[PDB]
Amino acid sequence: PRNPKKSGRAAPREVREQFTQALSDYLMQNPELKSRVLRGRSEWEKYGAGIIH
Amino acid sequence: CTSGIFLVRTPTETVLQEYTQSPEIKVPIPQKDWTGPIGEIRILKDTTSSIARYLYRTWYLAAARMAAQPRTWDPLFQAIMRSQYVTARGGSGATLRESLYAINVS
Amino acid sequence: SSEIQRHITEFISSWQNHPIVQVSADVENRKTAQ
Amino acid sequence: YVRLDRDRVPTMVGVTRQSRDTITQPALSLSTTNTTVGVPLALDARAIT
Amino acid sequence: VLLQRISPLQIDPTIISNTMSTVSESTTQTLSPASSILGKLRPSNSDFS
Amino acid sequence: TVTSPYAPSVNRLMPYRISNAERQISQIIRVMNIGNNATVIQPVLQDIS
Amino acid sequence: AYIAVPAVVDSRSSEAIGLLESFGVDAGSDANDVSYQDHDYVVDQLQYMLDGYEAGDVIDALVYRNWLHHSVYCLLPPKSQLLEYWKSNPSVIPDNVDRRLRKRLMLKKDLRKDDEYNQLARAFKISDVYAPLISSTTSPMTMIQNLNQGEIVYTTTDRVIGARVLLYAPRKYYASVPHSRFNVGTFPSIATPKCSVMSGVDIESIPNEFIKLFYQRVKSIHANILNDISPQIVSDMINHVDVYRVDVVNVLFEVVDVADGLRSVSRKLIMHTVPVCILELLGIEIADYCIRQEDGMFTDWFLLLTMLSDGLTDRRTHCQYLINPSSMPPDVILNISITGFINRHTIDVMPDVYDFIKPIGAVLPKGSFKSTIMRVLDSISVLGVKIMPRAHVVDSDEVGEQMEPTFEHAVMEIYKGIAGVDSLDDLTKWVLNSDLVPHDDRLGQLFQAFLPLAKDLLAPMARQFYDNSMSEGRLLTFAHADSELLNANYFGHLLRLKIPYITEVNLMIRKNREGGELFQLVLSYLYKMYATSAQPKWFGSLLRLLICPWLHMEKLIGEADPASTSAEIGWHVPREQLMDGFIPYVSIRAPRLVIEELMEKNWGQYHAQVIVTDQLVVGEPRRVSAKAVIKGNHLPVKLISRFACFTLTSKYEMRLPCGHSTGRGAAYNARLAFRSDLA
């Protein structure tokens, strides 16, 4: 490639965690999406635990 | 054999020449063809003599058939349409911020 | 001018002659909500 | 719900809200002062099957 | 014009537009019969010359 | 299961019971409203869904 | 007991404001038994919960609440962080939890990979341990039921309504009241036999719009089983002053023709939300009144009332009325008789569109009473302020009068384009027949010619006139149609407006206007046809803001010290650059404790290029005119808080009371600066 790959400048952990969390909160806003994804995670850890990390 | 130059002029000239144009509406919708207000909106009377009734019918039927589809009522479609416009390009976040500030919200 | 005041009175009468109950829009969302 | 004979297949359902003439009885004016009601609604054979 | 000024009959198109809608929707592929005839008879605000 | 008291009371008033002709007339009026549009009837089926 | 009111009730502030004298209750005494309730968070929860659920479900659930039964939620972290909290600080464990799970959590092992504990956690669910557990999919009716029966409720989500939410674990494991026999608060219920709702306030006048939705939905389903009680019944049962919140009622009156001693009622009307302070000032009560008092022109306290309110509708047919401005029959209102007052409540006089400090454009139809309302409005000056001087307002004809052929003269020559007219009177005869309501086809043929005059001359002239006016201060400008202010790119607030009269009759009453009265009227029709249909919205909506806040502040600062209660905030230029003087731009008036708070605000992050001139003004104080153009951002209203009464218009000018000599003018790059005395 011929473009400068922008590396992470190592932002602080607190503010970066807060930023990513608020962004996720914006994405999955209603209880139904969250319930779907949480049920998926539960079913994965019941069955799909091991084939993917 | 025609020149292929990128024409250039000052931004304050583009904004003052283009954005001053206004429509030239020679046969407006009569004032007696609008019902009373419903919030911020008035409705075309069904007995209008204008040509806007076919426009109204087309958009009305389109809206009804769009909203009737059960796909537009799951959280996935809602979320896709939400995230459609959340890009890495500018959106004038300043004036948003300083307009939210004017009502004492952080 | 008396002709002009006749015009004025005729317009005020015609303005008073408005309808009271008139459904002229389309009522289908109202039917569904009903 | 008629199963497979034509003779019991419903071909219209109508309602009346006024009479027709000098006649007065609903059982007489109903056959010619009705309005048909009803409308189809599509489905998906794939989804159902 | 003389007949129009003498006649008691006033033609308001709030009867056609009231007994049936211009956005009635069956068979969502195309226009329904009601919508079709209303679009073919825009009721009026004009001269019946 | 639902429960109801069994003891002397204080003479309530709740006017809810009605006859059959009234239900039938209301049903006829609802049908003659809903007739031939399918947009008045789509949401009912969606709610039952 | 419990009583519900159409307003956001709070235990902190609603006692200070009262709200009961607000709605019209005579609770004023050593009552101290009408204890309010906290419904702020409940309204917020309702708003947040309508986001995911459905309005019918949420409202029909929240209606069955027993607000006199204390209770509370407390949400649990999810199962993983929950187990992490079980482990660390383990002496909080409920005994329901499995014996094996407790015996394995009591161990100090790393728990990196315990082959059996993973299974024991997989088969573990939160619902069995904590008995009342609402849901992630509660379908909320059981929420309100469980709040009704019990003291504490256990949720795994945040979308809950009815009580406050308390935390279970510390903040690490999460992401980012006595009774008084007369409890009150919003959100009526039907839980008990003693829940009542206070009637007397219409549903369409409720301003919160969530309380409004709740009341509409509950009152359309539970009409026959609710307990209505009026303000008088509530009174018999019981027995930082915010500006821009005014009490409004509407007056019930009817028209009477008292000729030769024979009364005859003729018509009944409702004035629709005149503010209470003006009725107190004018001394209006139940009696007869004459609304002309001389030469067929309104007595102008009646004009003030009609211009301070929404419009009057007939009570027989529930439709708008538009009382007659003339003095010619069929209909003439010469004697009225007020008979009573109905629904009372507060409203926010500050329109939501007004957030920044900028000019105001008020569109009105042609035949309105702009001249008389200016004549009546320029006189008011409450605390030596002169709230609306005559020089701060721009007449509607000014932009058209400043042309060599003026605009109306340009359109008078429009009869040449018609197929044949030959004269202005023949034009007025060809257009509308022997009354108004002209022929629509002929009016269209005339409008197709009138339009190019308005798009090619009036718009280019106005695009410069409004800029020149904006340079020299904030001004209140009028127009005849919003298209004039839209085509000519007008900056500021665009307030459409409307008057409760028949404006078309004034165009025949007034005499000395250019062209015949018929021509003025046809011109008004053309402007009305150039109008881009949108809600005009009741002219009083602006006059109420103009007048009402000053009258209230006059009670607070009626007798205080003018030096201590005053301020002024303009554009500052240093003592140098004379080759200190500030242009005012605003004049605040407020109590001393708020002037102290405004003294410390920034006021300096706002810049503009001031251009001082050397011209003299005929006015008494020796002052030189100037100009100013704000750069970057406009002054938001939040700085001038809801507790001060500022002015909405101002001219740009500087006074020179030192070494009188006007030199050469200049531009200086001013900066905003607060300017009050010692105080």
TrEMBL record, chain B:
It comes from the Viruses. It is found in: Virion. Belongs to the reoviridae RNA-directed RNA polymerase family. This is RNA-directed RNA polymerase. The lineage of its organism: Viruses, Riboviria, Orthornavirae, Duplornaviricota, Resentoviricetes. The chain holds residues 371 to 476 of 1267 of the full protein.
Automatic annotation (TrEMBL), chain E:
It is found in: Virion. It comes from the Viruses. Inner capsid protein that self-assembles to form an icosahedral capsid with a T=2 symmetry, which consists of 120 copies of VP2, with channels at each of its five-fold vertices. This capsid constitutes the innermost concentric layer of the viral mature particle. This is Lambda-1 protein.
TrEMBL record, chain G:
Pfam families: Reovirus_Mu2. It comes from the Viruses. GO terms for molecular function: structural molecule activity. The lineage of its organism: Viruses, Riboviria, Orthornavirae, Duplornaviricota, Resentoviricetes. The keyword Transcription does not apply. The keyword Signal does not apply. Its main location: host cell. It is found in: Host cytoplasm, Host cytoskeleton; Virion. Keywords: Capsid protein, Host cytoplasm, Host cytoskeleton, Virion. InterPro entries: Reovirus_Mu2. This is Mu-2 protein. GO terms for cellular component: host cytoskeleton; viral capsid.
